[PDB]
């Protein structure tokens, strides 16, 4: 049910095609082991012919007859075998995949649409809670996981039955208690394998989790770097914790590693154990009873069974996951909560006109406990009027303006439109009949026209034309390029909020209501526009009855009535002069107011070269690698031997021959490998450890040392970098361990196979190598195309989903709801196309998969057939075919390798290239001399000449175009610019973060072009807007490890002293010892700046960069700090730059720079004397 069933609902000819495909799956699995059996009977006839071949030494002609007999005979049998099966799979494989999509396909389509409309209907809850972000995200993420859940489930079914029926059909049928010898030994061994192996496997995971914890404590902060570049470079705290925990769980999860290893050793040691009881119990039960050399088929086949239970397991996992996902957040999906609103049938007050009536309504936000903002409120408002709501402490005004749209049903009491109660009339209708314009005016990415059209679907540009013009929009929309068809460069990002807002008004204007709510509308907008905007509002509302809430008491006046609010609290109602005449709230408040990137450079064999660089040595590992390899073909022969030396030979000793080869198979594989792993995993794994550590280090310092427009002008977020660090070291480790499983698999498969290929008598050797390359080639080609379709669909769906987020992500739609389905509808179209395309690709997956299995039979058949070729009287055609199985199984061996161990190279090589380009870099500023700190360079006179520059992005021309100023010593360079850039760039430039594109500078005596950077920054009393401190105790922060500068206590005290942060230092728990506590949050920026300043005056500079420092503070913070910055200066030169146009008066040389070019300068009154620019600045300052 629900879980599983709801999970699998929706589907007539769906459910039917489904059960059909399941069936195909069934028969298919059954194919694999039937195929086993037949391999058996062909093999038996093969023994009989080899047995009499063994006898030989007699009637030659009867050998030519007995032989061409079974030859051509089983030759017929082989034919009908590849046939029956072969054709079989092709047909049914294609069928089970047609299961996959036909099913999941339609099933999701249905899902998809229900959810789209579902979300769009959850209404005010979809704001009430839900990250919304986390939502759309889940829309796609989950929807898809459902998909995988369905077609893979099919895969399982199929295998569930090749295992079930195999282990059965043969696991019993053949042997009658011998097949049980199977059941017995076999399933039992298989038991020890499953347990022990899986035991450690869980053990492994636990190892990996503890790893993860250590890796986070391997992270810490890595941002704020600007502050940290003027700091120097942590460099050692990072390494410290890094290699600490890493090494730890390195070798540790590396024991579980060398335990995954020790695990390969498990399953495999225990694999050859299989071989043990396998052959053992076999041989005994082959010299006594059931003497066939065909126990093979049986036991061997039951083995196939185990393997299949494996594949079945991952498929099942898939199912369950997709279930959990959909099903649970499906009740989140399907489910039709709503009721807090709806958008269907209802009541219709077509009387048009009427008065609003807020009657005795209490209400608290959706968040169950906040105060009932509307704490019992009554109000009424006549028609054609326009009422002003006046509040400030938030939480009310806006809200009544809220439910006046039924946004939320009234907690208690009620409201009435016209004369009926809001709740009673239908929504779509209400919402329409209620024009509304709030602050944030949002415009979807489209033409102006289309946005107004959103206001009203059907409607002709003649009406829009009217609309705009009515909302004074007609002018700009006309001069602006393209006209109404002009767009809106992705989101409402292209024009001024002023016009945005206007456009809106137009939108709502075509909606043409009878109620109009203006939520501060005009607000948060430039003054002049505010005018124009309110202007359009005016020409809009009187026709309509309107409730407006706002702060511009200036635009309040003309209120037919006002009401007193201020954070949920109704009081004084009435006309202006009345609420002023009251000298109450109105009057009161009235007077109070007066992460993408991927790069082309690869690294052909380079990270190999550099590999070994990132390497000490471990030939040892590669050593056993070679052995592991041989180990495999070895098996090929040891087995081929058994069967051989028992399918044709001398009677006595066959027990010892058996028994021997049996144990041989065990001791050999079992041990050798257990070993192989243990060892190799030890050495090579350790290579992964180190490589990754000495790597995270290498890279990190590369960054610390790096700098300049890296973060100075990036698109390499803190994340992108923490990312790089962790993920990349890992990956690379991968590129090296890979070179290892390379020499290895290599020798094994080929080398060994080829030698034994010599003993191959050129008729199979060749017979196969042709086959393996082709079937191998399939593995590849198939997976390839499978990816193409996967990604491309991700694209089409991306168009759709991208736009479905546009909506859900923009709820400021339900506002009008005049799009709803219309919306998700446009997306119904998009889908539509990717849907038809989906049915096809369904088919595709099928044909492909199938064709692969057809290769299955083709391969085998041709093989065994050709091999057998010519056994007329006993010729070069006999047992050797078993070594043929050896080279076929060889190709399959290497297959294990590609589909196992480290990341398919790839992502690892990519990651390598990446972390390599990053580790290469250009220090740009480590050491250097460019002076020798001469014991006189203390003057501190700053020189800026020519100074032309633009932070790399130069196309936006520079913000410094031919600049030149300077600053005497022990004094104060006053900086007053336009805004933002300019003041910053200057500072920086001194800090020589970015070097001027032309011209030069002299902190005193010579090219702050070429002066030793580290020293240049030795002196820099820098303190900016947003201070900051990494979490050391403030005593340490204070002690900002500028360099060798030791934590001079009394020094840190000197700072705290003139810092005036001492006020917190005197008492405040733990005093200096108090860590910034939680990275900061526990102290006002005022105190913070006190510390920053400390830091600085602790450095005992000579020059100072006071970048608008206090430009966000208040009273005694501001002031006291100016007292700090005060005594902080005059002892040294300092460019105090700011937007404190006021307190800037105490300046030595005040320069008025106009972004790029300096236009005014001199002393204050002298500047005013120069009535003009600086003047206007002071005249606006008022
Ligand atoms: Hg599919
Ligand atoms: Hg609130
Ligand atoms: Hg090895
Ligand atoms: Hg800038
Ligand atoms: Hg710190
Ligand atoms: Hg200053």
Question: Could you characterize the architecture of this molecule?
Answer:
This protein has 1182 residues and is α/β, with parallel strands linked by helices. The strands form four sheets. Strands 6-7-8-3-9-10 form a six-stranded mixed β-sheet, with helices on both faces. Residues 981, 984-985 line the site of one mercury (II) ion. Interacts with PSMB5. Glycans are attached at residues 51, 55, 58.
Give the second-level CATH assignment, the architecture of the largest domain. Answer: Up-down Bundle
User: What ions, cofactors and ligands are bound?
Assistant: mercury (II) ion
Strand content: 5-15%
Distance between the termini: 73 Å
State the secondary-structure class.
alpha/beta
Q: Supply the number of helical segments.
A: 38
PDB class: membrane protein
Keywords: P-glycoprotein, multidrug resistance, Pgp, cyclic peptide, membrane protein
Assembly: monomeric
Entry title: Structure of P-glycoprotein Reveals a Molecular Basis for Poly-Specific Drug Binding
């Amino acid at each position: 049910v629900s879980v599983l069933t709801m999970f699998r609902y929706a589907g007539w000819l769906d459910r039917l095609y489904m059960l059909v495909g399941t069936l195909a799956a069934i028969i298919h699995g059954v194919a694999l082991p039937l195929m086993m059996l037949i391999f058996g009977d062909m093999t038996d006839s093969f023994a009989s012919v080899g047995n009499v071949s063994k006898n030989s030494t007699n009637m030659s002609e009867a050998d030519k007859r007995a032989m061409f007999a079974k030859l051509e005979e089983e030759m017929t049998t082989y034919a009908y075998y590849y046939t029956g099966i072969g054709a079989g799979v092709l047909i049914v494989a294609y069928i089970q995949v047609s299961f996959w999509c036909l099913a999941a396909g339609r099933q999701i389509h249905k899902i998809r649409q229900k959810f789209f409309h579902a979300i769009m209907n959850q209404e005010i809850g979809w704001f009430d809670v839900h990250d919304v972000g986390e939502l759309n995200t889940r829309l796609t993420d989950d929807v898809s996981k459902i998909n995988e859940g369905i077609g893979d489930k099919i895969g399982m079914f199929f295998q569930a039955m090749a295992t079930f029926f195999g282990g059965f059909i043969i696991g019993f049928t053949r042997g009658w208690k011998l097949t049980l010898v199977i059941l017995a030994i076999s399933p039992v061994l298989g038991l020890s394998a499953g347990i022990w192996a899986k035991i450690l496997s869980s053990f492994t995971d636990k190892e990996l989790h503890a790893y993860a914890k250590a890796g986070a404590v391997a992270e810490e902060v890595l941002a704020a770097i600007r502050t940290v570049i003027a700091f120097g470079g942590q460099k050692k705290e990072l390494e410290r914790y890094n290699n600490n925990l890493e090494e730890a769980k390195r070798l540790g999860i590396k024991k579980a590693i060398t335990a995954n290893i020790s695990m390969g050793a498990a399953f495999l040691l225990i694999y050859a154990s299989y071989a043990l009881a396998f052959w053992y119990g076999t041989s005994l039960v082959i010299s006594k009873e059931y003497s066939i050399g065909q126990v093979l088929t049986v036991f061997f086949s039951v083995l196939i069974g185990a393997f299949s239970v494996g594949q079945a397991s991952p498929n099942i996992e898939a199912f369950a996951n997709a279930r959990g996902a959909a099903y649970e957040v499906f009740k989140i999906i399907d489910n039709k909560p709503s009721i807090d609103s709806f958008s269907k049938s209802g009541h219709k007050p077509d009387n048009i006109q009427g008065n609003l009536e807020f009657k005795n309504i209490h209400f608290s936000y959706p968040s169950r406990k906040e105060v009932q903002i509307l704490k019992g409120l009554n109000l009424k408002v006549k028609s054609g009027q326009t009422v002003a709501l006046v509040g400030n402490s938030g939480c009310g005004k806006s809200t009544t303006v809220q439910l006046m749209q039924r946004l939320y049903d009234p907690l208690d009491g009620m409201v009435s439109i016209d004369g009926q109660d809001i709740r009673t009339i239908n929504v779509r209708y209400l919402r329409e009949i209620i024009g509304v314009v709030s602050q944030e005016p949002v415009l979807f990415a489209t033409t102006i026209a289309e946005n107004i059209r959103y206001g009203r679907e059907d409607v002709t540009m003649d009406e829009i034309e009217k609309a705009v013009k009515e909302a004074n929009a007609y002018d700009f929309i006309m001069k602006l390029p393209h006209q109404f068809d002009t767009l809106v460069g992705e989101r409402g990002a292209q024009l001024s909020g002023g016009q945005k807002q206007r456009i809106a008004i137009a939108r709502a204007l075509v909606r043409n209501p009878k109620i109009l709510l203006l939520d501060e509308a005009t607000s948060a907008l430039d003054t002049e526009s505010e005018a124009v905007v309110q202007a359009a509002l005016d020409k809009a509302r009187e026709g309509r009855t309107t409730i407006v809430i706002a702060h511009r008491l200036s635009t309040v006046r003309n209120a037919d009535v006002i009401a007193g609010f201020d954070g949920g609290v109704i009081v004084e109602q009435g006309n202006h002069d009345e609420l002023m005449r009251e000298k109450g709230i109105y009057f009161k408040l009235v007077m109070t107011q007066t992460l993408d990137e991927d790069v082309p450079p690869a690294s052909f064999w380079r990270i190999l070269k550099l590999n070994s660089t990132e390497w000490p040595y471990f030939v040892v590992g590669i050593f056993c690698a070679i052995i592991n390899g041989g180990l495999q073909p070895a098996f090929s022969v040891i087995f081929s031997k058994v069967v051989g030396v028992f399918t044709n030979g001398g009677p006595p000793e066959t027990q010892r021959q058996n028994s021997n080869l049996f144990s041989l198979l065990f001791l050999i594989l079992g041990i050798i490998s257990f070993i192989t792993f243990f060892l190799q995993g030890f050495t090579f794994g350790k290579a992964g450890e180190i490589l990754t550590k000495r790597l995270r280090y290498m890279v990190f310092k590369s960054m610390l040392r790096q700098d300049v427009s890296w973060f100075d002008d990036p698109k390499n977020t803190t994340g992108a970098l923490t990312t790089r660090l962790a993920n990349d070291a890992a990956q690379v480790k991968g590129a090296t361990g890979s070179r290892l499983a390379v020499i290895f698999q290599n020798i094994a498969n080929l080398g060994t196979g080829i030698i034994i290929s010599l003993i191959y008598g050129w008729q199979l050797t060749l017979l196969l190598l042709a086959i393996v390359p082709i079937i191998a080639i399939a593995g590849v080609v198939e997976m390839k195309m499978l990816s193409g379709q996967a990604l491309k669909d991700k694209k089409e769906l991306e168009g759709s989903g991208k736009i479905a987020t546009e909506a859900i992500e923009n709820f400021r739609t339900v506002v009008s709801l005049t799009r709803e389905q219309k919306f998700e509808t446009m997306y119904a179209q998009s889908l539509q196309i990717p849907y038809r395309n989906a049915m096809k690709k369904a088919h595709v997956f099928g044909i492909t998969f199938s064709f692969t299995q057809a290769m299955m039979y083709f391969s085998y058949a041709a093989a065994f057939r050709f091999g057998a070729y010519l056994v007329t009287q006993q010729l070069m055609t006999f047992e050797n075919v078993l070594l043929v199985f050896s080279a076929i199984v060889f190709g399959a061996m290497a297959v294990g390798q590609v589909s196992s161990f480290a990341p398919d190279y790839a992502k690892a090589t990519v990651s390598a290239s990446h972390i390599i380009r990053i580790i290469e870099k250009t220090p740009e500023i480590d050491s250097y001399s460019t002076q020798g700190l001469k014991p006189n360079m203390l003057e501190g006179n700053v020189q800026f000449s020519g100074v032309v520059f633009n932070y790399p992005t130069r196309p936006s021309i520079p913000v410094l175009q031919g600049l030149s100023l300077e600053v005497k010593k022990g004094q104060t360079l006053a900086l007053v610019g336009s805004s933002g850039c300019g003041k910053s760039t200057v500072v920086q430039l001194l800090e020589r973060f970015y070097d001027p594109m032309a011209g030069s500078v002299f902190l005193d005596g010579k090219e702050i072009k070429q002066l030793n950077v580290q020293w240049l920054r030795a002196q820099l009393g820098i303190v900016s807007q947003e201070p900051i401190l990494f979490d050391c105790s403030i005593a340490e922060n204070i002690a900002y490890g500028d360099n060798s500068r030791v934590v001079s206590y009394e020094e840190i005290v000197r700072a705290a002293k003139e810092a005036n942060i001492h006020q917190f230092i005197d008492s405040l728990p733990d005093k200096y010892n108090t860590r910034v506590g939680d990275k900061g949050t526990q102290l006002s920026g005022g105190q913070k700046q006190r510390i920053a300043i400390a830091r600085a005056l602790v450095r005992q500079p000579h020059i100072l960069l006071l970048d608008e420092a206090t430009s966000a503070l208040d009273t005694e913070s501001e002031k006291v700090v100016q007292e700090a910055l005060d005594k902080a200066r005059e002892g040294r030169t300092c460019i105090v730059i700011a937007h404190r146009l006021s307190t800037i008066q105490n300046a030595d040389l005040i320069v008025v720079i106009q972004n790029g070019k300096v236009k005014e300068h001199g002393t204050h009154q002298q500047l005013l004397a120069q009535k003009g620019i600086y003047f206007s600045m002071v005249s606006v300052q008022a």
